[PDB]
Amino acid sequence: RHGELQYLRQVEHILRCGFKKEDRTGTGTLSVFGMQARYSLRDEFPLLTTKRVFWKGVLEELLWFIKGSTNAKELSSKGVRIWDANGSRDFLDSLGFSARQEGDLGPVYGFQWRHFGAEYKDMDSDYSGQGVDQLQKVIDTIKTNPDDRRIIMCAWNPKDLPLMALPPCHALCQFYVVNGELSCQLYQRSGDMGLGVPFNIASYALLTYMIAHITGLQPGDFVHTLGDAHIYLNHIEPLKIQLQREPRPFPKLKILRKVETIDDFKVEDFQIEGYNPHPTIKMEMAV
Amino acid sequence: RHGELQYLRQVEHILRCGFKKEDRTGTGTLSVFGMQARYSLRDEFPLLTTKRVFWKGVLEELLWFIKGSTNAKELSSKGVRIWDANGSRDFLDSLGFSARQEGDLGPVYGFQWRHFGAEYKDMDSDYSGQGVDQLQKVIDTIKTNPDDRRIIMCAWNPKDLPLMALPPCHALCQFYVVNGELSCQLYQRSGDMGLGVPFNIASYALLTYMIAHITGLQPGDFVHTLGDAHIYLNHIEPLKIQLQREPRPFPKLKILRKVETIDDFKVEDFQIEGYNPHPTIKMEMAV
Ligand SMILES: *C1=[C@](F)([C]N2[C]([C][N]C3=[C][C]=C(C(=O)[N][C]([C][C]C([O])=O)C([O])=O)[C]=[C]3)[C][N]C3=C2C(=O)[N]C([N])=N3)C(=O)[N]C(=O)N1[C]1[C][C]([O])[C]([C]OP([O])([O])=O)O1
Ligand SMILES: CN1c2c(nc(N)[nH]c2=O)NC[C@@H]1CNc1ccc(C(=O)N[C@@H](CCC(=O)O)C(=O)O)cc1
Ligand SMILES: *c1c(F)c(=O)[nH]c(=O)n1[C@H]1C[C@H](O)[C@@H](COP(=O)(O)O)O1
């Protein structure tokens, strides 16, 4: 059956069997703890079709992670504004970060992926050669010892949490190789089913395609594991509309040239083919 | 119906559909990537019944983690020898720890859980007040903000990996509160289905009982998530024997006095009630 049906069944399960659970943002949710889905990456790319997903946002956000950036405004220069609210003067002030520049998210994904364990200063600092380049380590291990059971990139850093504008929603991922295929599992501690989760699915599928490309492997599965999987109260009616829509076959992702290192990928290297979504569904972000 | 059927079905699935995957130990495995099970902790305790599980081992190992120990000899002194092989002279030497005293596992679970980010020296150093006490922070957060979606204890420490005799198998866990119940999800990167996994299920169920007790909550679910779930080749025959056995109702776990802090729990504080396992099944550990 269509892989998108897993996402839709998760949404329906939360609507039907989820518990009312208040949250940080003051919005309110319906919530379930503990879910898992498996999205095949084999000649298909799991960009949801039951609404038009902002693929440019997914793509730019991942390249921004990869380059090690923790500056929301670097992403905003690309017309991708998704991290502006959590980097705003008001939001940073609400957390007591009145001294740092607007857009400075702290030692979040980019910094942990490429410099885990280095001493964070600000978003502009030069961290070259400092900390653990987990992303490069993952790639190197896949190339040289693919049976390894420790192929992990972890953005969760207990020491640095107090400095983060938002601790990583996508906390840890693990890679796996068998039969010439590269799979990835994400541990996502917290999943906004309406906004974040469709992005997260596409983002880690894309990352897996990227790493598969540079390691000469074929993409296998993306296994999506959720902790607190929730529907914000103001997404209930939009999601009930979405749930009635028939998925279209997933698109394909093409990489348009041979790229040798993870740092060399550019937006122009990717083409989504055969993407036929239902119309955009508006959903407001909980700050 | 019976929660143990999930474990048995996972084992059966790996036997039937798992792929042959070579491994670090040289033993070989049948392997699947990405599994999830949910063990209820409500008025019962998921200590497997299709073989007799070494409960004293589970209990002493967890208390050893909680006290921050990284010395296998301190666990061995309790009659629990399960960590001895990975702290042995030959094993340490194989990894390059030629000057390290036998028993010194490096900065593994106990250290990461109570002192994340501290500078490891050796297993006999005093780390009091150094690093992040993740376990106490989990407890405090459950008490002060049970809705929090960041209640995580993570042993995975990229910076410390090179010093570890064995990187954490149980890599990260997350706690969750709803309906007066405390639930726990474990992200286990690597699961030895025959030996480790039955211990891991009981261990995290036990930790959840302990924290629920301290925080005035009822145990909810233990959600078990696996990365590389595998059966060692020399466990195939023993597990096939196990698969022929019908589970008995799970036992209960009783806590025998009011305990106020996680560090005050002692072996004598616990009673497994109504445990009726099938006979012990011997399985050899892959070093
Ligand atoms: C988290 C995370 F990180 C995410 N996120 C971020 C941001 N992002 C975003 C934003 C916005 C958006 C939008 O808007 N979008 C679009 C539509 C859709 C499509 O198409 O796709 C447009 O606009 O167009 C997007 C994205 C940060 N923050 C946040 C987020 C989300 O999602 N949500 C919110 N509310 N916020 C990830 O990654 N994921 C997820 O899921 N996340 C979440 C979870 C929760 O809810 C939150 C956090 O909180 P805590 O409390 O848990 O910490 O988030
Ligand atoms: C999770 N661990 C683990 C590992 N290595 C492997 N291959 N598998 C594992 O599960 N290294 C580190 C740690 C060691 N834990 C363990 C846990 C149990 C046993 C074991 O031998 N248990 C037997 C008998 C124990 C007894 O009764 O004395 C059992 O039947 O459970 C060994 C190592
Ligand atoms: C290790 C443990 F410590 C544990 O708690 N549970 C486990 O299941 N294991 C297993 C997993 C694997 O068989 C070995 C560790 O080997 P690597 O994955 O590090 O090669 O022990």
TrEMBL record, chains A, B:
Keyword Transferase: yes
Domain of life: Eukaryota
Active site positions, chain numbering: C169
Domain Thymidylate synthase/dCMP hydroxymethylase: 6-287
Catalyses which reaction(s): dUMP + (6R)-5,10-methylene-5,6,7,8-tetrahydrofolate = 7,8-dihydrofolate + dTMP
EC number: 2.1.1.45
Keywords, alphabetical: Methyltransferase, Nucleotide biosynthesis, Transferase
Matching InterPro entries: Thymidate_synth/dCMP_Mease, Thymidate_synth/dCMP_Mease_dom, Thymidate_synth/dCMP_Mease_sf, Thymidylate_synthase, Thymidylate_synthase_AS
Pathway field: Pyrimidine metabolism; dTTP biosynthesis
GO terms (BP aspect): dTMP biosynthetic process; dTTP biosynthetic process; methylation; tetrahydrofolate interconversion
Matching Pfam families: Thymidylat_synt
Any one GO MF annotation of this record: mRNA regulatory element binding translation repressor activity
GO terms for cellular component: mitochondrial inner membrane; mitochondrial matrix; nucleus
Keyword presence, Methyltransferase: yes
Family under the similarity heading: Belongs to the thymidylate synthase family.
Record function comment: Catalyzes the reductive methylation of 2'-deoxyuridine 5'-monophosphate (dUMP) to thymidine 5'-monophosphate (dTMP), using the cosubstrate, 5,10- methylenetetrahydrofolate (CH2H4folate) as a 1-carbon donor and reductant and contributes to the de novo mitochondrial thymidylate biosynthesis pathway.
PANTHER family, per database record: THYMIDYLATE SYNTHASE (PTHR11548:SF2), THYMIDYLATE SYNTHASE 1 (PTHR11548)
Protein name: Thymidylate synthase
Organism, scientific name: Mus musculus (Mouse)
Organism lineage: Eukaryota, Metazoa, Chordata, Craniata, Vertebrata
